[PDB]
Design a protein around this ligand. Structure first.
Ligand SMILES: O=C(O)[C@H]1O[C@@H](N2CCN(c3nnnc4c3sc3nc(N5CCOCC5)c5c(c34)CCCC5)CC2)[C@H](O)[C@@H](O)[C@@H]1O
Ligand SMILES: O=C(O)[C@H]1O[C@@H](N2CCN(c3nnnc4c3sc3nc(N5CCOCC5)c5c(c34)CCCC5)CC2)[C@H](O)[C@@H](O)[C@@H]1O
Ligand SMILES: Cc1cc2nc3c(=O)[nH]c(=O)nc-3n(C[C@H](O)[C@H](O)[C@H](O)COP(=O)(O)O)c2cc1C
Ligand SMILES: Cc1cc2nc3c(=O)[nH]c(=O)nc-3n(C[C@H](O)[C@H](O)[C@H](O)COP(=O)(O)O)c2cc1C
Lengths: 643, 644
């Protein structure tokens, strides 16, 4: 009989200094998801308002189903929030990326109850993040829910977890699945019925023990393994708590059956066979709405990612929305989840690392798509590691290892960090953030660097958690690092793909970033407030040419893509032309006359064609075609150049 | 039947915890409050004193508690931000480590052994003042933690840590109309309220009854003995009791004094109609060795030394002080300037804290007759000229103070270099400047002309000197220079500062910075790091510097004679000057028994010259009072005397 009520439709202000004692009448109206940094946090100057803001909404006991207790669930309040019911402080949280709850049954004394939520995203030495290349969008950017449950219920107060913990064990062709639940105010005489359901919902296992036994082991014969995108099979665990034979409360969670390994020489292994993890990272924001994404935004992001053919996503730099982790479960993406422990170690932030890390594991333990827990990102950027940095990490490593025996810990290291720094040796695996070819150096340096690490530390699995290069709507025929041209970014990824994708020992690579994202302190490239290293634009409206370089290597979608479509006016008499395709042969036609048929090891078909007058280019690979136009001109169209 | 229970003994303390402990710690460090974990690392320098989160833990045995309907936890001082847990449950948070706060915890006393965990924190953030000040932010429970047992119906304990009673006297001629306001909680409409106002000897002088529904009464006292400063710090006591039947289920009380005052822009401070020059000192709430974990005797000793000095006012900077110390000022007739730690840099996001601390200051100290001005900020424009956020912040405080307290004025402590035409100076009722001409560059003589120039330009704003001072360690010279840190130059500086300030009646109040040396862990100057050495007495209160006696000469009617330079013995010159302070008219000086001359000092600064030959014994005499010292001729300056 557990019921969930949406509570998203709220008075807001940034000027209050105190909890209002009655419903405000002159405050601005918002419906959640909401953030007050939607505009000021994506235009630059690092001027997005950071402070304390108040939300106000009235909760009428009448317009409510009746249960023994009413909880207020908050899926995301960035960064720190305080909750008042009728003026009385009832709950506080620090961490803008996790779910927390609060039982408010006793505070609903009135017919109409005033719920005020203050949210804060300022500076302080306690709550992460504080130093990162991404806007700390303030507010209630995820749902706010009201949960009505029986007096006896599965746990809602333990670190915002689901109250159920499923752990499959694979014995041969069968699965033995531990389904542990956690109860609150349970009577010794109640029973718990455990059911494991089919992908089509057909009951495959069921058992029944008393409330006293919150753990059970159900067998699944001939279990269909969660084999990622090949076959991302999902079972459904479902526990009901019964009084008499009435079921007063029940919880559930989809789950997946899989084993995996991270061999330091063979790379990632899934269910016994090698499964190369090649993919991208994604931030949880979009142009114009800050980070108040709706479900369709998640759906659209994953669709664009799966269209690219990525088999892994690095979900930096923080815990993402549950719905997006679900999508990754259904689609078969291997995910790297982490906490906002980044850039500089604040000693007084140790508690917050432990707090967020626990919510990360507790709330997401049941996502088959997740295989590693990231402890920190570029944490030694400030300098070499301290004893306090090392202790803070060991504490987290041990805590994760004890809570979850089925996954591995990882680290994302700043490029410059000495490979002999003690902190690299703490977690199971590690990945480096390298920007050779954008932040100086040459893109040819990446391959060698990785190799030379692997020679030094051949038994620590090494990944590339970050690589990328900026790209706006600038174009040139001589791509060069620093021009922000779509072409150079395309050349950069061509070389990166050829270097990384051919090295099996790199257990995972992650393009930074899949999309452009909000970083209000950025002021470069002709458009401020954004990091432009994505393969797709901040509004998900334009796939850059580099997006198709990756489709050529990783997608089973037959396609043909002409690069350069936005670079029309060119001065040279002969011009270079590049086609990306996952098909063997590609023929290019300039104004109807074929310029040749080509194949390519690396799926990058490089043509050279005469540039005379106005020409129309057409790429054909079997039954697939694409269209580009160009035009000779006497001088370079400066509208293409950043200057 | 309200009962207060001390709760300071045996607390488990740690700086290494990461979470609230589930059971009573067995290996933590035992402490008894008042306590601060910065008692050493916060007074030695390096700015390294530990700032973060540390945990206190102690058991509450229900049996040992008296029988009452409700049990409140009270905290007089938790620097800077704290959280309260009762059996792992959170039940209260607070921001501001100088105010009193309480929390009703009856319903979480579910066991016979209840685990109370208070987490205290003094870190870095943009919300809670202070964050940039020249004094240590001592962490921990440095003031009393009490438990209050009261009846279900009781006087308010949840309104910003107030007393639940607000006494406001009005002086109509030779009589006083005393307004008595009390505040209740869960009061039955059929209970009564008995207001009684008693004597300085406790003899009932007025009394009225009313039902719980009338929480405001005006009682008369004719021929009222006014609180007239040091001349007569007369104190009545108000006393309201809540009765159910003729049981008295709860009762509150407060001392108060009835006085009027004015801050005239030309006549200075006026008290009860008569001019009453406010010339005094500032005082910090710390002390060498124990950080800010002060016991009553330390408050007593602190004001005793001030009373010996004869100061008529104290600037209790930079924050709300302890309740005991405000009381003492009430008893001794000192006129007090109180303020909040809104200091140095304006943080936009700290606005809510300025309002909470300022609301707490006024509610928790409205009743102290010694207080006349509420300070809004100290050197708030240091890190720049006044902008709109700073100015809205100040107007908001100014109006709130004026709305809650009609009988007092608001002031500010302006940093020295702040343009006198800053819109910031125009917000409060009065203002004072913090000037260090003669220490932070400049010359001591500049103080007079500067104050004259402001007074010319702004004749209608009462101007005071909220801070002046000069460092002084145990260094000595016969050639005082700004920057040698010598006891001599600091005495010369304060002589000149006295002749300039004490003769200008329009300055409504002067505050020597500071009465005592104090803890400022970021300082590293003078030969002893971790302290500000601008006091007239040293951090441990064991040595009154010469400058101390220069003021006693001007403010004490305790007749005395002081030889300065007692610690400067070996001197090189053949003739040496000898400074004597005395509030008597004539001083004769004797060198080895032979008299070197009588002297009458109008300014009480008796400057003699004497020969320096061999071992000389100096004796100063003013009637029946004498003082002694010793000097010695030497060939070369004693290097032990110079900072070098
Ligand atoms: O940056 C991204 O795109 C993403 O990567 C991660 N981080 C990567 C490293 N990091 C940097 N951020 N900004 N600038 C530089 C670095 S390192 C570096 N090295 C540089 N060179 C110095 C000369 O010699 C060779 C190296 C130069 C610059 C930078 C910029 C100025 C010119 C030279 C912080 C962000 C963040 O997790 C992510 O949130 C962010 O979005
Ligand atoms: O300082 C005290 O003891 C007390 O005074 C008040 N505040 C006064 C000003 N302020 C300063 N603190 N420390 N140093 C300086 C200032 S201003 C200044 N100006 C200076 N030069 C400017 C250019 O020309 C010559 C003079 C110099 C110095 C300082 C120090 C080094 C030498 C030159 C903060 C404290 C505080 O309200 C009080 O909380 C504090 O305890
Ligand atoms: C993924 C996961 C979910 C968990 N969920 C709960 C829970 O909902 N309720 C609960 O009491 N314990 C839960 N636990 C475990 C215990 O809370 C925990 O191991 C132990 O009781 C320590 O509790 P503490 O963190 O409060 O010290 C969970 C553990 C894991 C690994
Ligand atoms: C010095 C002083 C002490 C006060 N103490 C209390 C008090 O203890 N309880 C109370 O209800 N009101 C007290 N008041 C007044 C009211 O709190 C105030 O007029 C009004 O209730 C403001 O409430 P708010 O601060 O919650 O907005 C006090 C006022 C002053 C000036």
């Amino acid at each position: 009989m557990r019921e969930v009520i949406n509570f998203n439709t709220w008075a807001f202000t940034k000027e209050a200094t105190e909890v209002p004692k009655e419903m405000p009448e002159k405050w601005y109206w918002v419906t959640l998801p909401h953030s007050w940094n939607e505009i000021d946090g994506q235009d630059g100057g690092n001027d997005y308002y950071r402070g304390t803001c108040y939300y106000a909404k009235q909760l009428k006991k009448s317009e409510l189903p009746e249960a023994d207790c009413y909880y207020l669930e908050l899926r995301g309040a960035n960064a720190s929030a305080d909750v008042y019911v009728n003026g009385k402080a009832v709950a506080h949280h620090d961490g803008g990326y996790s779910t927390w709850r609060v039982d408010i049954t006793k505070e609903l004394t009135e017919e109409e109850n005033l719920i005020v939520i203050a949210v804060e995203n300022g500076v302080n030495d306690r709550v992460y993040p504080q130093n990162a290349d991404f806007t700390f969008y303030g507010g209630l950017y995820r749902d706010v829910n009201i949960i009505a449950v029986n007096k006896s219920h599965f746990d809602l107060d333990y670190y915002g977890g689901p109250g159920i913990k499923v752990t499959p064990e694979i014995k041969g062709a069968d699965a033995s699945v531990e389904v542990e639940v956690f109860l609150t105010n349970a009577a010794a005489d109640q029973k718990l019925v455990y059911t494991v359901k089919d992908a089509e919902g057909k009951e495959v296992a069921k058992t029944e023990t008393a409330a006293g036994e919150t753990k059970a082991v159900l067998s699944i014969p001939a279990v269909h393994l969660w084999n990622g995108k090949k076959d991302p099979y999902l079972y459904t665990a479902e526990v009901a708590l019964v009084s008499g034979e009435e079921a007063v409360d029940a919880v559930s969670t989809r789950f997946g059956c899989r084993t995996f390994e991270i061999d330091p020489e063979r790379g990632f292994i899934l269910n016994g066979e090698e499964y190369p993890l090649r993919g991208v990272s994604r931030h949880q924001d979009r142009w114009g709405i800050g980070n108040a994404l709706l479900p369709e935004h998640h759906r659209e992001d994953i669709d664009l990612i799966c269209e690219l053919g990525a088999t892994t996503i690095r979900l930096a730099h923080y815990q993402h929305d549950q719905y997006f982790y679900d999508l990754c479960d259904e689609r078969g993406l291997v995910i790297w989840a982490e906490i906002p422990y980044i850039s500089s170690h604040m000693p007084n932030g140790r508690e917050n690392t432990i707090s967020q890390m626990k919510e990360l594991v507790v709330q997401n333990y049941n996502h088959p798509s997740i295989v590693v827990w990231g402890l920190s990102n570029e944490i030694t950027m400030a300098g070499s590691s301290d004893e306090d940095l090392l202790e803070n990490h060991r504490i987290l490593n041990d805590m994760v290892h004890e809570m979850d025996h089925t996954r591995l810990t990882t680290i994302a290291v700043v490029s410059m960090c000495d490979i002999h720094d003690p902190y690299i040796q703490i977690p199971d695996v590690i990945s480096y953030n390298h920007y050779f070819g954008w932040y100086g150096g040459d893109v040819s340096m990446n391959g060698p660097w990785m190799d030379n690490f692997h020679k030094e530390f051949p038994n620590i699995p090494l990944g590339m958690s970050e690589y990328g290069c900026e790209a706006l709507n600038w174009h040139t025929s001589d791509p060069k690092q620093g021009d922000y041209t779509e072409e150079y970014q395309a050349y950069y990824h061509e070389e990166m793909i050829k270097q990384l994708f051919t090295r099996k020992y790199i257990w995972a690579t992650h393009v930074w970033n899949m999309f452009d994202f909000g970083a209000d302190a950025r002021n470069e490239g002709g458009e401020n407030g954004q990091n432009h290293k994505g393969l797709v634009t901040f509004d998900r409206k334009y796939k850059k040419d580099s997006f198709y370089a990756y489709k050529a290597w990783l997608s089973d979608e037959p396609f043909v893509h002409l690069c350069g479509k936005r670079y029309v006016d060119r001065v040279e008499d002969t011009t270079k032309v590049t086609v990306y395709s996952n098909l063997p042969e590609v023929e290019l036609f300039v104004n109807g006359k074929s310029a040749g048929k080509l194949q390519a090891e690396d799926h990058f078909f490089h043509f050279e064609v005469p540039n005379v007058g106005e020409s129309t280019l057409v790429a054909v690979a079997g039954e697939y075609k694409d269209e580009s136009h160009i035009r000779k001109v006497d001088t370079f169209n400066e509208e293409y150049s950043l200057k």
